[PDB]
Amino acid sequence: KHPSGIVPTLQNIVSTVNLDCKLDLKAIALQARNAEYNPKRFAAVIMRIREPKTTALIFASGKMVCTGAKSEDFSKMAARKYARIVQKLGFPAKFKDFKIQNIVGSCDVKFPIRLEGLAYSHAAFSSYEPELFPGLIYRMKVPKIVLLIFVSGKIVITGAKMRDETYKAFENIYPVLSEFRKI
DNA sequence: GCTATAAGAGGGCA
DNA sequence: TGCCCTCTTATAGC
């Protein structure tokens, strides 16, 4: 399952759910101390909980975005709590169409990488402009995932809606990273 | 903090 | 249209 012997650590999960009822954002920002509401800056009530440590963006439409969780289960668990906070605030909040929208993972191959050489041999997938951003942007097509590769051997993998895409994307890149190890 | 990456949701504007 | 608005998170050089 993990031939490299390295398993990317999940760092951030973004999920969405439909509370299925219109929400009064001022009433929420007023009643719940946990919330922040700034209409002129952003159309959402920003609310946070300690466990699982997450941040929710709550919209008048009843739609909700949940960010910050370390796993898919934690994200859904956090979403459910926010849904309950809203219910208790006096809204008929449900939990419709919960969905994991993005998974961000990271790992360390423990060896430096020759980024320019990797970029050159994979021009169609790479974007490496160190003066702009020190990491190489690798847009993997299968699976459709974006990896940020640094000289240190540290790797960020983002864009996955399923964790196996994070894993597979890493496994695909591993042999390439090795080929371009900095001696 | 800023630079870059993915993804969601919405109001607002060119 | 079509993108920025906000927010999260790892990464690292500014």
Side-chain angles (χ1 to χ4, degrees):
Chain A
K1 212 295 196 62
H2 300 290
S4 57
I6 299 177
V7 186
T9 303
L10 302 190
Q11 306 284 4
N12 182 35
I13 306 292
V14 172
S15 63
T16 55
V17 70
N18 184 5
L19 300 185
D20 207 11
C21 71
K22 278 222 74 284
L23 300 180
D24 182 336
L25 302 191
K26 275 320 303 179
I28 295 177
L30 293 190
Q31 294 172 226
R33 195 63 78 194
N34 177 1
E36 305 171 26
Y37 184 38
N38 325 279
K40 49 75 193 59
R41 253 287 112 256
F42 194 56
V45 158
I46 298 157
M47 195 178 282
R48 298 183 174 84
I49 63 174
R50 280 182 79 199
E51 299 285 352
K53 184 184 172 181
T54 57
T55 295
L57 309 182
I58 300 161
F59 305 83
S61 63
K63 298 302 189 64
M64 174 170 82
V65 177
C66 180
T67 60
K70 296 304 194 180
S71 90
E72 301 95 321
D73 284 349
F74 280 139
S75 187
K76 185 177 199 166
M77 197 179 327
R80 266 147 39 187
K81 299 188 179 205
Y82 289 118
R84 186 143 297 225
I85 292 171
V86 173
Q87 284 164 23
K88 292 181 175 180
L89 233 35
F91 298 89
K94 298 301 174 290
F95 206 75
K96 179 179 174 48
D97 309 313
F98 172 78
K99 188 191 179 181
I100 298 299
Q101 301 284 4
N102 186 32
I103 300 175
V104 185
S106 76
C107 49
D108 184 0
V109 300
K110 291 123 183 295
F111 60 81
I113 316 296
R114 284 201 295 110
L115 301 183
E116 188 47 73
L118 195 162
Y120 188 74
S121 59
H122 295 70
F125 305 88
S126 312
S127 290
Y128 183 46
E129 303 304 322
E131 296 172 338
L132 300 168
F133 185 64
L136 176 163
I137 316 305
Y138 194 104
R139 292 187 168 83
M140 191 172 283
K141 295 187 167 72
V142 177
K144 191 188 189 291
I145 292 290
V146 181
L147 304 90
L148 309 185
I149 304 162
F150 305 85
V151 179
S152 59
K154 250 59 147 56
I155 318 295
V156 174
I157 310 164
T158 187
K161 281 200 173 65
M162 295 290 275
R163 72 165 53 187
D164 281 345
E165 293 167 346
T166 304
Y167 299 155
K168 203 249 189 179
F170 177 66
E171 290 297 319
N172 288 355
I173 209 65
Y174 192 73
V176 180
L177 300 183
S178 294
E179 181 180 5
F180 292 95
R181 171 164 60 87
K182 184 179 301 193
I183 315 293

